[PDB]
Amino acid sequence: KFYIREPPHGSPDWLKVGLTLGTSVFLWIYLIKQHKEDVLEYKRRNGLE
């Protein structure tokens, strides 16, 4: 192609990409689970409902 040598990131690293999405979905579903736990626990703390 253009570059005579292989590029530093030309073909993307399937590994690092895979961990990137894997951690991001982890952070999102942990965030959601935490929010639900906090809202229910706050509801049962002061006996609101």
């Binding site: 192609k1 253009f2 570059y3 005579i4 590029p7 530093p8 990131h9 030309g10 073909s11 993307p12 990409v17």
Partner: protein, 320 residues
Amino acid sequence: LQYGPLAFVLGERTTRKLTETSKVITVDGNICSGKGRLAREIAEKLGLRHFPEAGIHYADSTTGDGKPLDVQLSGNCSLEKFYDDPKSNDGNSYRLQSWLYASRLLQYADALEHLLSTGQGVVLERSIYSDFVFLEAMYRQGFIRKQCVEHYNEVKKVTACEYLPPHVVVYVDVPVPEIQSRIQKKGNPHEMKITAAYLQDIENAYKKTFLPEMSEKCEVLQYSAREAEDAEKVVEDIEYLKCDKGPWPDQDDRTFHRLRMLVQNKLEVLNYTTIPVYLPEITIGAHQSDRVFQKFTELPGRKYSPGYNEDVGDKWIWLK
């Protein structure tokens, strides 16, 4: 993974791969003194690879497709203008010398990286240590001013000391009048317009500072034209010398790590090639620099990081 501190911590050394056959050589001599020929002969006789003499567009060869970029974009200087009109106010000559210095600097950088990474030896046509012969020979011929010479020396001291001298260097001794006859028979009209005093001055500057100071840094092999004709004898000479002179032996793996760090970062190597000194042939103006940098950006493969330019045929940029 490219070599870094983590590789040394892991255990990636370079004394292990480096052997006796791992040699870095430069074949130096006068103009068309058969240095390229003899360099190739010692290359494939000793089994070592060959990087040709660095020129204007050797760096253009290093990055991307390797085609020689536009002269204006790649240092706005030409060897043909040097040969035809030597003395002019535009100062193409010192621009030529500085760009050739930096190109040979990066050539030596890549050469050092090669035999410090894979262990295969490297052969070259001239180098930094033979680069000064030209500039001094020109300056003695009423060619450039001494401010350009002092900028050259200041750049040499701060961009050559971090590197270490070659293993062996071969000199092909060809008399200057024979060189004049050779350029007569060559045919290229530009090399006709040469001062024979300039050729004699190249020869003088070679065997007055280059070879002497070389002899205290590595092993020198002075060969006459006929002596260097029979390449087998010169390769068997370079085989049997001692390979025990210079800073190459007293070179621990930690200084190996240092020199690999230096060579692997090209921007570091030529960082001091652009020191602010404001020389009449070196200061590209603000407007000229802006336009020329924009032109370099519109050139394919030079807008984004190498391996990300979509215009050139890259792919997977959105998950790269």
